[PDB]
Ligand binder design. Structure first.
Ligand SMILES: N=c1c2ncn3c2ncn1[C@@H]1O[C@H](COP(=O)(O)OP(=O)(O)OC[C@H]2O[C@@H]3[C@H](O)[C@H]2O)[C@@H](O)[C@H]1O
Length: 252
C-alpha cells in the first residue's frame, strides 16, 4: 500500500527459488559440497525465519541451517572485508588466492538478498522487512550475517586479511559487523596476525591511511587480544587488481 509495516525493503522476489537455485549451482561447482541436499538446506533456511516475528530472530534459529552448511575453508586464506564488496570479490575471483564469506555456500546463498516472514503466518513478507536501525537488530537478515560472520572469523588461522574502505569517514567502524563481531571472534590461539588493506578511493596515493585514528583504534584492540596487527595502503585499487591478474606482470 501507501504505508508498510516495516522500514526496510521487502523480501527479494522469488526468494525460495533463488536460494534453491544458488544451492544447486554452488554444490555443482564446489566438489566438497556434494553431500549437501538443497531441499534440506532450503527447509532449514526457511525454518529459521518463517512463522517467526521478524524482530525476534536469534542465532539458534539459524543453527539447523548452519549445521547443513558446514564447510571447511582453508583457515590461513581468509579475506574479511568491510564496506568494499566489489574489490574483495574481484580479487578472490582472479585465482582464489583467498576466500571471502561469499565464497562459502551460506554466504553465496544470501548475498545481495533480503528476506523476512510474519509472526502470524507462514507467508514470506514481500512488502517490507525490519530495518536494522529503525525497527530492530534481531531481524532475519542481520542475525544471519552476524551468525555466519562469527563462525567464519572463528575458523581463521595464521595471517587473516581484511579489506577496509578508506573513503568512509570511519575506515574501521566499531559498529560494523567486522568491528562488532569479527575482531572479537578471531581466536588468538590460532591467528598470528590481522593484516588490513586500506583501499583508497581517489586522487591516488594521498595520505597514509594506516595512520588514521580508527586504524590506530583497530591496532590497539587487536594488539590487546595478543594478535599482531599489520596495515597496508592500496593507493590505486585498479592497478592492484591488474597486478594480481598479471603475475610477473611487468610491475606487480
Ligand atoms: N554479503 C552481504 C550482504 N549482501 C547484501 N547485504 C549484505 N550484508 C552482509 N553481507 C556480508 O556480511 C558481512 C557483514 O555485513 P555488514 O558490514 O553488517 O553489512 P552492512 O555494510 O551493514 O550492509 C548490510 C546491508 O547490506 C545487505 C544486507 O541485506 C543489509 O543488512 C559483509 O561484509 C558481507 O561479507
Amino acid at each position: 500500500r501507501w504505508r508498510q509495516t516495516w522500514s526496510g525493503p521487502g523480501t527479494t522476489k522469488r526468494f525460495p527459488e533463488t536460494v534453491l537455485a544458488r544451492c544447486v549451482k554452488y554444490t555443482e561447482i564446489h566438489p566438497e559440497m556434494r553431500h549437501v541436499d538443497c531441499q534440506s538446506v532450503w527447509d532449514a533456511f526457511k525454518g529459521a525465519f518463517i512463522s517467526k516475528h521478524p524482530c525476534d530472530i536469534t542465532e539458534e534459529d539459524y543453527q539447523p541451517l548452519m549445521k547443513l552448511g558446514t564447510q571447511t575453508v582453508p583457515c590461513n586464506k581468509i579475506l574479511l572485508w568491510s564496506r568494499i564488496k566489489d574489490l574483495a570479490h574481484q580479487f578472490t575471483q582472479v585465482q582464489r588466492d583467498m576466500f571471502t564469506l561469499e565464497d562459502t555456500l551460506l554466504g553465496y546463498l544470501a548475498d545481495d538478498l533480503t528476506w523476512c516472514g510474519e509472526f502470524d503466518t507462514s507467508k514470506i513478507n514481500y512488502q517490507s522487512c525490519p530495518d536494522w536501525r529503525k525497527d530492530c537488530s534481531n531481524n532475519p537478515v542481520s542475525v544471519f550475517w552476524k551468525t555466519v560472520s562469527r563462525r567464519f572469523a572463528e575458523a581463521a588461522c595464521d595471517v587473516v586479511h581484511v579489506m577496509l574502505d578508506g573513503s568512509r569517514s570511519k575506515i574501521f567502524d566499531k559498529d560494523s559487523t567486522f568491528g562488532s563481531v569479527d575482531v572479537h571472534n578471531l581466536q588468538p590461539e590460532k591467528v598470528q596476525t590481522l593484516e588490513a588493506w586500506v583501499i583508497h578511493g581517489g586522487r591516488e596515493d594521498s595520505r597514509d591511511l594506516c595512520q588514521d585514528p580508527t586504524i590506530k583504534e583497530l591496532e590497539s584492540i587487536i594488539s590487546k587480544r595478543n594478535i599482531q596487527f599489520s596495515c597496508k595502503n592500496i593507493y590505486r585499487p585498479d592497478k592492484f587488481l591488474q597486478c594480481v591478474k598479471n603475475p610477473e606482470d611487468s610491475s606487480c
